[PDB]
Structures are given as C-alpha cells and as structure tokens.
Amino acid sequence: ETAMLGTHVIWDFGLQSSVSLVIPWISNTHFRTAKTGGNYDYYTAGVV
Amino acid sequence: GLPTELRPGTNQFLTTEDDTAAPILPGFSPTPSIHIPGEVRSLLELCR
Amino acid sequence: GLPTELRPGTNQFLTTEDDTAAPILPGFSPTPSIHIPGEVRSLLELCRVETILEVNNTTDATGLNRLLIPVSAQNKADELCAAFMVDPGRIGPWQSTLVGQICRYYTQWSGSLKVTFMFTGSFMATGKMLIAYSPPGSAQPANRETAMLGTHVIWDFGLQSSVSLVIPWISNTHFRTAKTGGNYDYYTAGVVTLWYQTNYVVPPETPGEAYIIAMGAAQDNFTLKICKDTDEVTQQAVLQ
Amino acid sequence: GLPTELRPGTNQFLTTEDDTAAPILPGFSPTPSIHIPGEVRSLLELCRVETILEVNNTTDATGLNRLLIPVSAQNKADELCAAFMVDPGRIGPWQSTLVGQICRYYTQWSGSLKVTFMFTGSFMATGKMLIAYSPPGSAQPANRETAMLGTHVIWDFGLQSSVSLVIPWISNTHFRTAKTGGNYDYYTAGVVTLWYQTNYVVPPETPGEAYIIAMGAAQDNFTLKICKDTDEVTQQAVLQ
Amino acid sequence: TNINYYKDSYAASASRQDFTQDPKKFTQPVLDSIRELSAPL
Amino acid sequence: TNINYYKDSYAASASRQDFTQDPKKFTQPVLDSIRELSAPL
Amino acid sequence: SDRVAQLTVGNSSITTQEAANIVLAYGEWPEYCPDTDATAVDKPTRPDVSVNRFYTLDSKMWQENSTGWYWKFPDVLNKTGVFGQNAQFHYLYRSGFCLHVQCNASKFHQGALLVAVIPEFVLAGRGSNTKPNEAPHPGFNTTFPGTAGASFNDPYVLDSGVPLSQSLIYPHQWINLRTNNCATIIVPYINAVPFDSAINHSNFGLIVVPVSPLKYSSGATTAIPITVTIAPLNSEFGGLRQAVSQ
Amino acid sequence: DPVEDIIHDALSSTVRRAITSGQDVNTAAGTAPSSHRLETGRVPALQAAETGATSNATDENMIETRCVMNRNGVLEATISHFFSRSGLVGVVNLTDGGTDTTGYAVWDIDIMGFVQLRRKCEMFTYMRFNAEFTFVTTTENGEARPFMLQYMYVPPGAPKPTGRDAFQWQTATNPSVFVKLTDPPAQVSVPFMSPASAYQWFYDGYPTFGQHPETSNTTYGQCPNNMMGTFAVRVVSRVASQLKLQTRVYMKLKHVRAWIPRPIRSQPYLLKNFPNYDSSKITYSARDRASIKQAN
Amino acid sequence: LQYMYVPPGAPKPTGRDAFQWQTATNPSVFVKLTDPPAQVSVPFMSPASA
Amino acid sequence: ETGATSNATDENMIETRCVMNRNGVLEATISHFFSRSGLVGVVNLTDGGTDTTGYAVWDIDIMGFVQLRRKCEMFTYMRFNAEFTFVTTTENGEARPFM
Ligand SMILES: CCCCCCCCCCCCC/C=C/[C@H](O)[C@H](N)CO
Ligand SMILES: CCCCCCCCCCCCC/C=C/[C@H](O)[C@H](N)CO
C-alpha cells in the first residue's frame, strides 16, 4: 500500500511471459554519478 | 374566471347523448386491427 | 354569462386524468438541471437488460444457490438438466428477473424474449447442451427426442462461455396477459428445457460439479399494454 | 348550452392563485400617478444594501453596543477578535441586517455575500486584521494558522477605514435553505472569523479601546426561491 | 396572451411581469461615481 | 395543440410526449463495439 | 488481439492477458464540470497527475464459503496519497473512477464473481423492529468501511433489500475463472449536484459477489486472492480550508 | 510554447465523443425474413456475458423468420405515462372532538410512507418532476358535511401552527387552500422545489460532518434535499366542531425525468426513511417448486 | 365513493381499507354520491383483434 | 463613510471560475412578493336572540393583523389594486344555507 504510490506496473502472467517496467529519469540534476555512499547518496535513484 | 351560466339540462344523464368522456388509460395503443371478412356497416345490409 | 351545461362526469376525480392544476407558487424558477448520466426515457430500455433468473427455485436450495443450475458428469445419456416455463407474468424463475418484475406492472406483453446461459465451470471441462423451447401444447417433454422438435439451439462449451437462446414470438393473439391459471392458460407461452446434448466431460483433478447461470431479457420487439397494480408487495399499516 | 365538465379543484380558494375578479366600480378612473423618487421593483435591490450586523450579540451587552466589536492592544499575538456564522437564515448576527431579515421571507437562498468592516478607532491608531471565511467542515478554527487556509483577506488600517470581505458561493447544491439545525446543517455555509493580524498599535494619549462596525449585504449573484411565512413576528389577539 | 373578461383594467390578473432592476440608486446614491477598483478617497 | 390556462409552465398537463429510446447505454455500455454476428472474444 | 489490454493513468499502468472488455458505465466518459452546470464561484484545482493514478487496495482472500465484499467511493481514498490529502483539505469534490478487479486462478479452478457498481449504495439495518426509535441502523464502520472494505452478511439481498438478480442493470462485469481473470469499469461522476463532499457522501459502491462459489480439486492452490485497484479520473476539488478527516 | 505539456492536454481535454445516439422509435420493431445460413466463423448465438454487455442475438440471426410490419404501440411504456397516474401518498387524521383539544393536524411531506407508489418511484435513483396534488377529505365514516377546511403549506423554516386559531393561519405568505368538505377534491400543482438538481431517494451518506456513532446511526442516508416542508390542516372555526375527519393525499408525477435505474425491492418495507428489512425472514423473489426439472 | 378498475392480474381488494385501494397504478374514480354520474371512456382492450 | 455600499465583486478579490448562472430572480419582484393573499380582518356577527343588532360593521383597516402588515410596512408609499375574498362560516366552522 506504500509502494503503489510510486511509479509502477501490474504484470499479468500468461502468453507473452515477459513484462518490461521502465524506470523513468526522475532526478534533479541532469546527471548522476556512479559512486554512492557517504554524501554521494544525494545521487541515489530509488528502489524497485 | 370566465363568466358562465348554467342552463336547464345540467347534471342529467341522457343515455343517447353524443359527448366525450375522460379516458382512463393515457397514451394507450390498442391491439392493431386485422382483416376479418364479412364487415357490416348498416343494418340495411341485413334486411335485404 | 356564457350559457353552459354540466354533463355526467363532473366533480369526479379520475386518478389517471391528464389535466391542468392551479400552481401554488406564481413566478417560480426551479433549480436548473445539470447533466446526470444514465437517463432512462422508457421502460423498454430496462426490459432489454439481462438479469439473473431464479431457475433453481426449489426447497432446500436457500440463499444464492437459487441462481445456479447444477451440471455434473452424467452416466446416462439424453438426460434432462433443467426446465422452466417462459411466462414472465407467471410465478417462478422469471419472477426474479427485471423483465419479469416490470411485466407485472402492465397487463399484456408482446414480443420475443431471450435467455443467456453462462457456464461457470472449469476451463478444461467441456460439454454440449441442447436448449429447446417448446411452444404450447402438452406438458414438458419426457425425452429429448420429443423436445428436439420445438425451437432449439445446441450449445457448445469452450471459449465464449455463454450462449443465448431467443424465445421467438409464437402466438395467436398479438398480446398475452400476465395472468395465468384457470382458463387464462390459453395465454401460456410454452416451456424451455435444457437437456444434456452429449455429456459434461472433465479431465482428472478437476471438479465434476459445475454451475450454469441463466439470465433472461426481452428482445427488441417487446412491448406492453395497459398498466396495472403489481402483486409483489403487501402493506398492512402505514410505515411510521 | 355548451357542454362542460367540472374537474377537481372547483370552489377552492388558493390564496396564491393568479386570476381575475369582478370589479365593484365600473368605469373607474383612479387618481393619476406622480413621480415619487426611490421606486423599488425587486427585493434584490434591497439585499445589496449594507446594513449593520449585530455581531456582538452577547448577554451583558445591552443597547447599541451590540453593533460594535471591540478592538484593543493585545499583548499576545495571533489572537482571535471575533467570529460568527455566515448563514443569513440562521439566528444570530445576520438576524439584524436587511438581507438576513428578508432572506427569512423566502426558503432558499443562493449567491455570494459580502461583509464590510469599518474601523471607528482614532486616526493615529494603526493595526492589521485577518478576516478568514472558512467553508463548512469542522467548527471554527482554534488558532489562526488553521484559519489562514480558508478564504481570507488581510485588512490594513489607515485611510479608507473600511475593508470588504466577499464570502464567495462555495457550495454543492445550487441553493441553501434558510432553516438550520438537525440534519439541515447539511446546508451550513461555514464560519467567518476576524483575527488580529499583527496588533492594534497606538501612540501615547490615545485610547486603547476602539470599535469595529460589521455590515453585511448580498453580492450581485444573490437570488431567492419559494416564499415562506417569516418567524420573526408573533401575535396573540387582534390589534384593537 | 393573458386576457381580461371585464372592461376595467383593474380586474386583470397579472397583466405584465417585468425584470427591471436599479440597485445603483440604493447602493451607490453618490454624486461622483466611485470606480470599482480604485481607492475611494 | 394542448393549452395551459396559467402563465406557469409547471401547470400544463402533458406538454410533450416523446418517443426516444437509447438502450445501447444499458445493454451495450462497452468500449469497443461488439459486432452482432462475430465472436465476442 | 482483444484479450490483451493495457491501461495507463498518471505514473501507473495495468496489464492484463485474459480480460476482454472495458465497460464504460452508462456510455459516458468522466469529464470536467462545464461552466453551464457549475454553481461554486471559486476556481477549483485539477492536479491530474498527483491523484489520477492506480491505487491498489489490500487483497481479500476468496474462501470456499465466502459471501462477498463492498467498498464505498471515494471513501477508500480518503487517507492515501495526494487524493486523500486533497479530499481532506477540500469541501467540494468531483471525479470519475476506473475500477479494475483481478482474481486469477488456474485452468482447473472454477467460479464466478459479479463485479458491479451501485450508485448511492445505501445499506440497510437487518432487523424486524418497526418503530423508528428502536430500529437497528448500520454502524459508521459498516457503512463507510474504508480502505479495508467490508464483507456482506446476506448478499442475496445486497444488504439493501433489493435482490441481487436484478443488480445486473448496474454497470457490471463478470469474472469467470474459465474465460477472464479481471474486470474493469470506467464510471463517470454520478450525482445530482455539480460537486459534493468527499468525506460525507459516497457517490457509489463497488460490489464483488462470488455467485458461483470457488471449487477446486485437492492439491491445487487454496489461497485465491482478489485485488482491487482504483484510478480517479478527471478529478476536481474546491473549497479549501483546514484539514478535516471526517 | 515554452512548456507545451500543459497546452497539449488543455486543447485535448474537450468533450470526448461518447457516441450512444438513440433514435425516435414510434412502434415496436418488426422483423426481416431470413433463410438458413451454413457458414463458419460467423456465430450470432455464441455470446459472452462476462463482457458486461447483453446478448444481441436477434430473431433473424437464429431461426428462419418471416417479416411482420409490427404496428404494436410502445407509448404506454415511457416513464411519463408510467408515473402519470395518481396514487395515495399520505393520510392525516383530524379528531376535532371535545377530548382532543388540538384542532389542527400536521403531516411531514414524505411520500415514502405507502409502498404502492414508493416501490415504483424507488426503481429510479434520481428523479426530477412536477407533482399534482389532490386532497380528498371525508369523515371517519366516509361522510361529507359542510365544514370549511384550510390546508396550509409550511415550507422548511416557516413557523408551524400551534393552535386551531393561532396567528400562523393568517397565511400572508404561505400558500393556502380554503375548501369546503362538500366540494370536489382540492387539486394544485407543485413544481420541482428541491435545492439540488434532482430528487434522490437513496443518499449513501450523512447530512453533516462530525463523529458518527456505531450503535444508533439514526442519521445515515437521510438527505435534506428531499424533505420539502410540512402540510397543516384545520377546520376554519373558533370553537370545536365535534367530528372525526380524514384527509387523503394523492400525487401525480408529470414532466418526469428519471436517472440511474435500480433493482425493484423484493423484501417488504419496515421503515419510512430507511430501507430496512429483517435477515430472519428473507422472502425469496421466486416461489418454490418441487423439483428443478419439473416446470409446473 | 371510490371505484377501482382491477385489470386481469392485479390484486383484488381484501378489505374496506386494505392497501390495494392506494391505486398507485390502477385507474380509479373518486366521486360523491350526490354528484352527477361518473363517466369515463375505455378503449378496445382485448389482446385479440376483436 | 461615503454612504455607498461596497462594490468589491468576486472576480476582483479571489480567483474565480466562470459560471453561466441560470438561477431565476422572478420570485423576488414585489409583484410576486405581494401576489399572495393574506388575512386582513374578521368580523363576528352574532345574530342571536340576546344580540338584537343583526348586522356587523368593520372599519377597513389592514393594519390589524401583523402577518401582512409587517410586509406592506417595509415600503413607505404603496400603490396597488386589491383583490378581496370573503370566506364566511359559523362559529364552529359550519356552512348553512343562509343568504
Ligand atoms: C396548499 C398546498 C399544499 C400541498 C402542496 C405541498 C407541497 C408539495 C411539495 C412536494 C415536494 C416534491 C414531492 C415530495 C417528494 C418526497 O416526499 C421527498 N423527496 C421526501 O420523501
Ligand atoms: C362589496 C365589496 C366590499 C369589499 C370592498 C371594500 C373596498 C376595499 C377598499 C380597500 C382600500 C385599499 C386597501 C386598504 C388599505 C388600508 O387598509 C388603508 N390604507 C388603511 O389601513
């Protein structure tokens, strides 16, 4: 009930056994660094 | 209202009068008529 | 003044009269209307809608199980599954549907009807049924070799789990009354029976008991005649 | 004579009927009319006029002091100065104004209202107030951080000693009834509260007690529905 | 199209209903017209 | 050609009877119009 | 070609492989209140991406002897998301909804759910007391269940006196475990007033009744859940003031 | 121009076409002849009730039919002519005797008191109409006696009468009907007087805010947009006229518009404003039979 | 007096003050005994064509 | 203090939408405000054996009953045509064929 608030897609099984969720580009800066940890978590992108 | 005057003959029921009467069923559509042979329109067809 | 004459019918109050009446509030402007979706203009829009049919209206069948006719793997062929009369004004299954509760407000009905049969069994379970509407005459058939002679349709299970048998308008008079019994059975419309065409074949590890939902509705040439006080409601004292 | 039929409604006397009546004086020519200034054609011209509001309608406030809300130098900030409900049909302050005494002759009212606040303090005394109209919901706010969320206007003192807060027409139905209480509170319109924005700053040798005159009126989209007998007058016997 | 059956004008019913308002004589009975969005004084 | 003797519209008798049906909003209230002779699914 | 379907609203999407149709209730889309029908003079607010999205309620386990569930709208969305906050801060609320109920099951399970909407689903007190001062009336939590949703006591009468058979006149859809696995319904704003409150009056209610009871052979999956998800479409709010939960 | 995600939808959120156009249907539908069709892939009988749409399998597509210029009428099925018939609404009992020193009777206008018309006007959820009221007034035995009566309409807000000769009966503003007991029934026409845009017989909600109990929730469902005032009746006199009187009210619904149909109630009524019933005695809509495959 | 028309199918009254007399749908004529005779017009109401 | 009422309308104070107001104002005109009859005066004619007068007299004065007086006194100068209606009963409220 807390996760449904973010971006999401409801995947149904059956034929076409693969769904594809697109993680959009939701950020403040135009770029995020590859390094994380410390005060670099300011560049974190969230959790799926 | 419109000034009127009641004349002799009010409230009487003349069994042979030719007048209108309030319908009971508004917006009524009877069963359609079909062609039944041997229609009689006047009793002079019977006297002959 | 103008000479007039009062005729029979004065001072009477005909509850169905179509006349004017002095308004109480002169120069009145009501609350303006807005667009409320789902406007109905004639009750024939309501008779066309499918509504479930209490066809399993037997004793010891309490609750929602009245809306379900059972289906099971029969060891004997040509066997009868269900039956009911097709008179909406009659008491019985049609007494639950909408067309059957609104055809009781009028006296005479005309036009064809339809009955949709939706299968609620498993997906791997197949079968065939024979839905036969028999015009008036004798009572319901004994065997299905007798029922096959009337109007009928052979329903196959699978995808598109619902078939719809249309009960045509087969009658002498242009209208049939809602009342039955006594010498009003002259207005009976016949009986519709659902027979096992072949069987209810089912693979292993799948329930052998399924259900069928019967829904009823009126066709596009349905029409009604003189109004009437329904007989489905009763009141003793005022509702205080 | 002409055949007629009497329908239900004969010989009745509908006090609000719009019909003719036989004159008593035939060939009558009344006294000619002259030009008398100040002709009123509809009561909506009367609802637009500002009239004072008995907003200080408390006990131990006898006389003309009911028309005055006091204002004084507050040592504590964010403090409440006055409050009243914005239902003209309700009993209370609006019961004194004209719009509120003429909205009782009709049942349902619609349209916005306005409330003018005229400051009657000294000239050297300044201040700011926050007038907040809160649509229906909970009761009046507790602090002004809660009241600032509704519709509001911040009134500055000085020249042009009167501000006017317009209570908009925020409602679900097109009309609200004049009756309140019980399950008629569904037609409540909210509460308007006057808070001390900053303070009532005053120089030396100037009174620290001033008053504010609240006047109420209807906006330009005010309208009324079905008439009604007012409930502000009572009579036991004939006035002989 | 309302009608009167008598030749006296004061026997008619609702001869003419009118929509004519003029609040500016009670709400703004002043000499110099105050503008709606300017300061009064 | 029905008539009303009072100037209030809500005193007339049966001002206009209409023949306007629209069952396709209760019988077929679906998005993609199902054909009458094709398979539904 | 017609079984597959994808709905997308706001930042959310819903796929489906076996549902085949989109029931548009009463053949009208959710739209904004036109100026010729509006009564409130203030300007409303229209987020259209903060509130217009698919909120997924909790799941209800369909048992062999279940009796059906009902939800009230917009009662369910009064404490979740920006919709909940807008409905708690605003007095006038208007919006259509898009319902989507999923109940998947193997090709060996059998059963049928009726998923319908009841405009103005007034519940009833079950009791033979005829005096209005001692008669039983449904409690607040029984009539406004909330996000949890409430269960029926006798669904044959829909807890409202009316029979369930004729309930098919409402915008409805079946979930037949042999053909489809989810049902969806787009319902517009159905009310006698342009706007209305969102915490006092619930425009309609959702009904899920297991008509054909769940039946399966031994060894299959016993936990068959039902999940509902709702998307308020073309939402407007007006009359802003402090937050009032109820 | 600078930001166009805001213009792309503003000029795309116009009236979306929801075509469900109806046509003027004067008479019932005829039929067209049909031969036998032995074709694959085109099946009008196979339907799918799971789509929420009703079957469209007509007669011509299923069995071989003739053609019939159906001339039957459909006018008596329109809701106008369905509600155009007056029915009992409420009855008041005015006992102006020596032991009953009241002199007046009062009736809260509520047509939900008698099942006959309630069952009809509750099959639709939102109704908007004009009413035509007719008051018959007799004694307890059914006799007419030349006593003049006054019916006053007290809208919500006005002061209700407090005595036989109280001042409220001056009816300076309230509409009132003076009629003798030996005259035709008094008939008036009342417009659509609700503050809302339509009467609703079911209001799934509460009138006011606040905390709502769970034991005696006597305020649930009671919409105020329905209550339209009060009806007071007295006999025009200064002293009591010793007679038992009974006034019956009949209402006709003209210029009707209905919205959002509703299942017709099956269980009996128990309360006026509330749709109560009893779970102990659930009256099934269909009468019971002996067996299922034994159609009587 | 009250004259009610009970078409075939409707419930016939069971008492002087039974509920059937509400005539919500059945046509009915209320008239006093000291008034002109009550006169109405009825159409061709047979289900057949004659 | 100018003696003029405030002219601050809605659009000039808060951000409003547009509404094609279709509400009616006809029931607010004084014509339809006074178009409803009300009680004015009541006379008591006791033609009994002890009251050997036989006639009653009433000075035409509508200021005797508050219900209509309160209305027609909100305006200072009025010019109109009246429509009088006389109901006449006994003390018990009975009608009896006496001319
Ligand atoms: C002097 C005339 C007195 C008779 C006229 C009284 C006014 C009648 C107002 C009727 C209001 C519409 C019909 C009533 C509908 C339902 O009773 C209410 N919605 C609640 O039940
Ligand atoms: C034979 C008919 C008798 C009834 C007609 C009597 C004449 C009525 C004259 C009414 C004069 C205008 C209305 C009266 C107004 C106020 O009562 C007076 N200005 C003083 O109160």
Author numbering:
A (entry chain C): 145 to 192
B (entry chain C): 1 to 48
C (entry chain C), D (entry chain C): 1 to 240
E (entry chain D), F (entry chain D): 28 to 68
G (entry chain B): 10 to 255
H (entry chain A): 2 to 297
I (entry chain A): 150 to 199
J (entry chain A): 51 to 149
Q: Which statements did the authors publish about this structure?
A:
The icosahedral capsid contains 60 copies of a protomeric unit composed of four proteins, VP1-4. The binding of such receptors can trigger pocket factor release and viral expansion, leading to externalization of the N-terminus of VP1 followed by VP4 to form a pore in the endo/lysosome membrane through which the genome is thought to be subsequently released. Here, we have determined three cryo-EM structures following mixing of CV-A10 Kowalik strain with KRM1: the CV-A10 mature virus, a disassembly intermediate A-particle and the mature virus in complex with KRM1.
Of the three bands visible on the gradient, the material used in the cryo-EM analysis was derived exclusively from the lower band. Thermofluor and cryo-EM analysis showed that these particles were mature virus rather than A-particles (“Methods” section and Supplementary Fig. 2). As expected, the structure of CV-A10 Kowalik maintains the typical enterovirus architecture and surface topography but a signature of CV-A10 viruses is an extended VP1 BC loop that, together with the absence of helical structure in the VP1 GH loop, widens the front part of the canyon whilst the extended VP2 EF loop is bent inwards narrowing the rear of the canyon and the VP3 C-terminus protrudes into the base of the canyon. This contributes to a distinct electrostatic surface potential compared to HFMD viruses from other receptor sub-groups. A distinguishing feature of this strain is ordered density allowing the whole of a 13-residue long helix at the N-terminal end of VP1 to be built. This structure lies underneath the VP2 helices that abut at the twofold axes, in a similar position to, but eight residues longer than, the corresponding helix found in EV-A71 and CV-A16. Disordered RNA density is visible within the particle, the outer portion rather closely packed against the inside of the capsid.
